[PDB]
């Protein structure tokens, strides 16, 4: 129950999942749109 691992960063997992987690870590509400907003995706690839 303590730690799920994840030694690797970058896009090791699904892009959508990665962007959603990034969104959540930054406080972007990606859930209600049922899709990831391109704006968040752009910001994602710009920050990360």
Swiss-Prot record:
Signal peptide: none
Family membership: Belongs to the Lsr2 family.
Protein's organism: Mycobacterium tuberculosis (strain ATCC 25618 / H37Rv)
DNA-binding region, residue intervals: 33-38
PTM remark: The three N-terminal residues may be cleaved by proteases in response to external stress. This cleavage may be required for oligomerization, which leads to chromosome compaction and protection.
Subunit structure: Homodimer. May form higher oligomers via protease-activation.
Deletion phenotype: No visible effect on nucleoid structure during anaerobic growth by whole cell staining. Sensitive to atmospheric O(2) levels, at 2% O(2) no difference in growth up to 14 days; required for adaptation to anaerobiosis, at 21 days nearly 1000-fold decrease in survival under anaerobic conditions. Consumes O(2) more rapidly. Has a significant lag in recovery from 7 or 14 days anaerobic growth. Decreased virulence in lungs of BALB/c mice; no visible lung disease at any time point. Increased sensitivity to reactive nitrogen species, not more sensitive to H(2)O(2) or mitomycin.
Name of the protein in its database record: Nucleoid-associated protein Lsr2
Comment, domains: The C-terminal domain binds DNA and the N-terminal domain is involved in dimerization. Both domains are essential for normal function.
Subcellular location(s) of the protein: Cytoplasm, Nucleoid
Top-rank taxon: Bacteria
General function of this protein: DNA-bridging protein that has both architectural and regulatory roles. Influences the organization of chromatin and gene expression by binding non-specifically to DNA, with a preference for AT-rich sequences, and bridging distant DNA segments. Binds in the minor groove of AT-rich DNA. Represses expression of multiple genes involved in a broad range of cellular processes, including major virulence factors or antibiotic-induced genes, such as iniBAC or efpA, and genes important for adaptation of changing O(2) levels. May also activate expression of some gene.
Effect of residue 35 to A: Reduced DNA-binding, in fragment 66-112
């Amino acid at each position: 129950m303590s730690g799920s691992g994840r030694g690797r960063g970058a896009i090791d997992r699904e892009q959508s999942a990665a962007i959603r987690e990034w969104a959540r870590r930054n406080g972007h509400n990606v859930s209600t749109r049922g899709r990831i907003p391109a704006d968040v995706i752009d910001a994602y690839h710009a920050a990360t």
